[PDB]
mmCIF file of C-alpha atoms in Angstrom:
data_model
loop_
_atom_site.group_PDB
_atom_site.id
_atom_site.type_symbol
_atom_site.label_atom_id
_atom_site.label_comp_id
_atom_site.label_asym_id
_atom_site.label_seq_id
_atom_site.Cartn_x
_atom_site.Cartn_y
_atom_site.Cartn_z
ATOM 1 C CA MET L 1 -22.463 -2.485 -11.604
ATOM 2 C CA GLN L 2 -20.537 -2.970 -10.271
ATOM 3 C CA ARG L 3 -20.408 -3.586 -7.047
ATOM 4 C CA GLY L 4 -17.414 -1.494 -6.463
ATOM 5 C CA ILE L 5 -14.479 -3.516 -5.200
ATOM 6 C CA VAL L 6 -11.449 -1.619 -3.930
ATOM 7 C CA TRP L 7 -8.300 -3.527 -3.018
ATOM 8 C CA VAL L 8 -5.410 -2.001 -1.088
ATOM 9 C CA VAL L 9 -1.877 -3.242 -0.494
ATOM 10 C CA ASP L 10 -0.034 -1.882 2.532
ATOM 11 C CA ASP L 11 0.958 -2.948 6.008
ATOM 12 C CA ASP L 12 -2.638 -4.062 6.599
ATOM 13 C CA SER L 13 -4.265 -3.593 9.985
ATOM 14 C CA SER L 14 -3.612 0.105 10.399
ATOM 15 C CA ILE L 15 -3.858 0.920 6.719
ATOM 16 C CA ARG L 16 -6.750 -1.515 6.507
ATOM 17 C CA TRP L 17 -8.897 0.086 9.176
ATOM 18 C CA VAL L 18 -8.365 3.593 7.815
ATOM 19 C CA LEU L 19 -9.065 2.787 4.182
ATOM 20 C CA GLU L 20 -11.652 0.088 4.806
ATOM 21 C CA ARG L 21 -14.118 2.034 6.880
ATOM 22 C CA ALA L 22 -13.691 5.263 4.951
ATOM 23 C CA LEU L 23 -14.045 3.515 1.625
ATOM 24 C CA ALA L 24 -16.863 1.468 3.074
ATOM 25 C CA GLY L 25 -18.711 4.692 3.642
ATOM 26 C CA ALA L 26 -18.463 5.219 -0.087
ATOM 27 C CA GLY L 27 -20.294 1.953 -0.616
ATOM 28 C CA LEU L 28 -17.480 -0.285 -1.834
ATOM 29 C CA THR L 29 -15.560 -3.358 -0.701
ATOM 30 C CA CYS L 30 -12.181 -2.470 0.759
ATOM 31 C CA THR L 31 -9.708 -5.273 1.410
ATOM 32 C CA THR L 32 -6.016 -4.929 2.224
ATOM 33 C CA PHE L 33 -2.903 -7.033 1.743
ATOM 34 C CA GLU L 34 0.639 -7.413 3.099
ATOM 35 C CA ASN L 35 2.414 -5.430 0.413
ATOM 36 C CA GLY L 36 1.793 -6.141 -3.199
ATOM 37 C CA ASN L 37 2.512 -9.774 -3.897
ATOM 38 C CA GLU L 38 -0.527 -10.733 -1.859
ATOM 39 C CA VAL L 39 -3.037 -9.028 -4.179
ATOM 40 C CA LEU L 40 -1.316 -10.781 -7.063
ATOM 41 C CA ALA L 41 -2.138 -14.149 -5.538
ATOM 42 C CA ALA L 42 -5.648 -13.197 -4.525
ATOM 43 C CA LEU L 43 -6.149 -11.606 -7.924
ATOM 44 C CA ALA L 44 -5.733 -15.037 -9.483
ATOM 45 C CA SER L 45 -9.328 -15.648 -8.424
ATOM 46 C CA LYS L 46 -10.701 -12.098 -8.439
ATOM 47 C CA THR L 47 -10.206 -8.615 -9.842
ATOM 48 C CA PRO L 48 -11.005 -5.368 -7.965
ATOM 49 C CA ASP L 49 -12.230 -2.251 -9.739
ATOM 50 C CA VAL L 50 -9.417 -0.182 -8.246
ATOM 51 C CA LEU L 51 -6.133 -1.221 -6.652
ATOM 52 C CA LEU L 52 -3.950 0.855 -4.322
ATOM 53 C CA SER L 53 -0.313 -0.072 -3.725
ATOM 54 C CA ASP L 54 1.994 1.340 -1.097
ATOM 55 C CA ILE L 55 5.410 1.312 -2.566
ATOM 56 C CA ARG L 56 8.012 0.668 0.042
ATOM 57 C CA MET L 57 10.135 -1.607 -0.854
ATOM 58 C CA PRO L 58 9.104 -4.751 -1.883
ATOM 59 C CA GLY L 59 11.080 -5.977 -4.689
ATOM 60 C CA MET L 60 11.591 -3.099 -6.940
ATOM 61 C CA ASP L 61 10.953 -0.294 -4.589
ATOM 62 C CA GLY L 62 7.265 -0.646 -5.158
ATOM 63 C CA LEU L 63 6.841 -0.485 -8.879
ATOM 64 C CA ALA L 64 7.734 -4.169 -8.887
ATOM 65 C CA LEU L 65 4.153 -4.844 -7.886
ATOM 66 C CA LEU L 66 2.898 -3.147 -11.025
ATOM 67 C CA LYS L 67 5.021 -5.453 -13.149
ATOM 68 C CA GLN L 68 3.381 -8.501 -11.590
ATOM 69 C CA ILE L 69 -0.027 -6.864 -11.896
ATOM 70 C CA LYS L 70 0.288 -6.568 -15.644
ATOM 71 C CA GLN L 71 1.457 -10.147 -15.915
ATOM 72 C CA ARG L 72 -1.546 -11.563 -14.157
ATOM 73 C CA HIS L 73 -4.136 -8.868 -14.640
ATOM 74 C CA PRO L 74 -4.728 -7.076 -17.725
ATOM 75 C CA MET L 75 -5.446 -3.743 -17.068
ATOM 76 C CA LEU L 76 -6.161 -3.533 -13.381
ATOM 77 C CA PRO L 77 -5.932 0.124 -12.281
ATOM 78 C CA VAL L 78 -3.248 0.605 -9.651
ATOM 79 C CA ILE L 79 -2.522 3.597 -7.441
ATOM 80 C CA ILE L 80 0.942 4.043 -5.965
ATOM 81 C CA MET L 81 1.714 6.394 -3.079
ATOM 82 C CA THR L 82 5.251 7.276 -4.159
ATOM 83 C CA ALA L 83 7.348 6.951 -7.304
ATOM 84 C CA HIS L 84 10.840 7.126 -5.973
ATOM 85 C CA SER L 85 13.447 5.865 -8.040
ATOM 86 C CA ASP L 86 12.606 3.754 -10.725
ATOM 87 C CA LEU L 87 9.750 5.638 -12.275
ATOM 88 C CA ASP L 88 10.467 3.559 -15.327
ATOM 89 C CA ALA L 89 8.313 0.714 -14.043
ATOM 90 C CA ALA L 90 5.667 3.284 -13.230
ATOM 91 C CA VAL L 91 5.225 4.330 -16.796
ATOM 92 C CA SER L 92 4.793 0.806 -18.011
ATOM 93 C CA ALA L 93 2.209 0.512 -15.341
ATOM 94 C CA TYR L 94 -0.004 3.072 -16.885
ATOM 95 C CA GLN L 95 0.215 1.057 -20.030
ATOM 96 C CA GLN L 96 -0.875 -2.051 -18.410
ATOM 97 C CA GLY L 97 -3.450 -0.293 -16.526
ATOM 98 C CA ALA L 98 -2.226 1.715 -13.681
ATOM 99 C CA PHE L 99 -4.126 4.732 -12.464
ATOM 100 C CA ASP L 100 -1.206 6.995 -11.533
ATOM 101 C CA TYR L 101 1.391 7.910 -8.913
ATOM 102 C CA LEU L 102 1.417 10.233 -5.919
ATOM 103 C CA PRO L 103 4.171 12.862 -5.703
ATOM 104 C CA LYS L 104 4.366 14.132 -2.210
ATOM 105 C CA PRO L 105 0.818 14.126 -0.728
ATOM 106 C CA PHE L 106 -0.835 10.905 0.327
ATOM 107 C CA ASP L 107 -2.699 10.047 3.555
ATOM 108 C CA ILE L 108 -6.324 8.930 3.341
ATOM 109 C CA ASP L 109 -7.561 12.316 2.187
ATOM 110 C CA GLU L 110 -5.438 12.350 -0.970
ATOM 111 C CA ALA L 111 -5.342 8.568 -1.231
ATOM 112 C CA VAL L 112 -9.079 7.991 -0.973
ATOM 113 C CA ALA L 113 -9.484 11.075 -3.113
ATOM 114 C CA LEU L 114 -7.399 9.561 -5.874
ATOM 115 C CA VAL L 115 -9.025 6.156 -5.405
ATOM 116 C CA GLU L 116 -12.631 7.298 -5.743
ATOM 117 C CA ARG L 117 -11.882 9.423 -8.787
ATOM 118 C CA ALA L 118 -10.377 6.298 -10.309
ATOM 119 C CA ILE L 119 -13.550 4.251 -10.021
ATOM 120 C CA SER L 120 -15.578 7.203 -11.190
ATOM 121 C CA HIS L 121 -13.529 7.838 -14.284
ATOM 122 C CA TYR L 122 -13.838 4.189 -15.065
ATOM 123 C CA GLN L 123 -17.560 3.934 -14.849
ATOM 124 C CA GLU L 124 -19.652 4.188 -16.593
#
């Protein structure tokens, strides 16, 4: 097992409480970060089974996070809420290990939905 470690990157607090408790009900560890760069730093000492990134503008709209993820982590599955402009970095993400991208829907329902299916498909 995996113990099931889910890491999320978004505004924290609000996004943390919603995804933490809900994901906690699933039986996994849900931790959140400031935006994307944070997980990168924390990842230097740990690797979650599933990673969720908010995409809103960090450095490269949001896909920038993926780039850093592949540099430090090898194939850490990432889940982005939106793919706005620069889908290019999104594709490379899947190569490095990204789970996928969310078109329009999101919220916890679709987010947690896409996050759980990620850990499940991995298992194994």
